[PDB]
Structure of Synaptotagmin-7:
Amino acid sequence: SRGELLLSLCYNPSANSIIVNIIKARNLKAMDIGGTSDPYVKVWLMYKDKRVEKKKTVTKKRNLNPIFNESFAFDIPTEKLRETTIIITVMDKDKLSRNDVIGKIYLSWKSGPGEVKHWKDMIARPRQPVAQWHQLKA
Ligand SMILES: O=P(O)(O)O[C@H]1[C@H](OP(=O)(O)O)[C@@H](OP(=O)(O)O)[C@H](OP(=O)(O)O)[C@@H](OP(=O)(O)O)[C@H]1OP(=O)(O)O
Ligand SMILES: O=P(O)(O)O[C@H]1[C@H](OP(=O)(O)O)[C@@H](OP(=O)(O)O)[C@H](OP(=O)(O)O)[C@@H](OP(=O)(O)O)[C@H]1OP(=O)(O)O
């Protein structure tokens, strides 16, 4: 409806890290009818309701199927995994006004069905990049 984003999660428990690989998106929704978009992807590491880190891909001008292939590493100790949320947002860069939200993804053990599945797959396959498509929720 708003597009899909393909990303992988790799949780290395001995290293206490989660690597987030923003791979690509497809069928992004444009602002106008028949127009284009300038998508970039934001990644926030959350602990409870507090932001721990923020990351950001480069922008892909005039591209509704952007390829990013960017990886971000986050430190997460075991005692905070249960309170961890990774929020991924596909944005639409606008030089004139405020950048619009295309879709958001909340990754944790207590999120939507597709998000919980991806999270559990990450937990169950430590040290493997688990990749999965996600519908973008407005
Ligand atoms: O000025 P922009 O290129 O549009 O980006 C800003 C900028 O983020 P970056 O500087 O990390 O690129 C803000 O951060 P500051 O420079 O003030 O530190 C950030 O604000 P917060 O990180 O404090 O949230 C804001 O994001 P927000 O939408 O949450 O206000 C974000 O704007 P975009 O996400 O729309 O690009
Ligand atoms: O949804 P996925 O499993 O990730 O695979 C898709 C899918 O490929 P298959 O349908 O053969 O699995 C697309 O195919 P169509 O829906 O068009 O039939 C294809 O798109 P194109 O063949 O039209 O190129 C795309 O390839 P790409 O994203 O490189 O354009 C490819 O993505 P994967 O690279 O993830 O296989």
